[PDB]
Amino acid sequence: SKQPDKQRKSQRRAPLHERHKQVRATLSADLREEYGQRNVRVNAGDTVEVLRGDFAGEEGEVINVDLDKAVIHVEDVTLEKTDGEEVPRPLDTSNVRVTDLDLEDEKREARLESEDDSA
């Protein structure tokens, strides 16, 4: 649908498996060349570099990925609460870039390398 209300609606109500595409980030130049893909679903093992927020320029390992809220926790990308406890400042994966992947999963590595499919 070209209608905005329907667009937003389908994104906010997409089922869990369809929410994977809502946590995808662009790949670095070397990775794009190595896997023939422009982007990939950020995983909790991948290393990422912040390209946009107040944390732009920072590098870190992805500590968490929430499909429900479609955001990720990157290491050291935090906010200091009033009590002093540092807590994660969620990031939209579109403001982030993948520099290193976590290929421990046979299935993930397979999808990344296959030409007919994407990950």
Partner RNA sequence: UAUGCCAGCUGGUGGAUUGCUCGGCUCAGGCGCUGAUGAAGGACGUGCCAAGCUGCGAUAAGCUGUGGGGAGCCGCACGGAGGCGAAGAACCACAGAUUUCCGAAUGAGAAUCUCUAACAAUUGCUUCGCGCAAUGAGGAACCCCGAGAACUGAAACAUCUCAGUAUCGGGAGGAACAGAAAACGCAACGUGAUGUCGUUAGUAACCGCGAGUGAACGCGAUACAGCCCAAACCGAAGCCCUCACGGGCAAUGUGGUGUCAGGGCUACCUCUCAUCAGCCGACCGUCUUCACGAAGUCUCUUGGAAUAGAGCGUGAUACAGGGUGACAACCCCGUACUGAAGACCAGUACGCUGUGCGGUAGUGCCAGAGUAGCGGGGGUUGGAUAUCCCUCGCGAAUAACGCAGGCAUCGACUGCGAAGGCUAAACACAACCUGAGACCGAUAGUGAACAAGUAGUGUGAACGAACGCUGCAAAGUACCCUCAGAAGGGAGGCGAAAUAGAGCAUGAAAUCAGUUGGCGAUCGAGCGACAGGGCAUACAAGGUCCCUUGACGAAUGA
Partner RNA sequence: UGUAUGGCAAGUCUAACCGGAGUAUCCGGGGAGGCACAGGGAAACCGACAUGGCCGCAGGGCUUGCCCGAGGGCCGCCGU
Q: Is 95 in the site for Na ion (CB under 5 A)?
A: yes
Question: Largest alpha-carbon pair distance within the chain?
Answer: 51
Q: Is 13 in the site for Sr ion (CB under 5 A)?
A: no
Q: Nearest CA to 77 among 89, 63, 93, 92? A: 89
Minimum CB distance to Sr ion smaller for 41 or for 97: 41
Look at the alpha carbons of 58, 63, 67, 68 in this order and tell me if their dihedral is positive or negative.
negative
Residues that bind RNA (CB under 7 A): 1-9, 11, 15-18, 20-22, 24-26, 29, 37-39, 41-44, 51-56, 64-68, 79-84, 87, 89-90, 92-95, 97, 104-108, 111, 116-119
